[PDB]
């Protein structure tokens, strides 16, 4: 969940 | 800002 909104890793990057 | 969050650069890598």
Known sequence: ???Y
Do not use: A, K, R
């Open 1 to 3: 969940l909104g890793n």
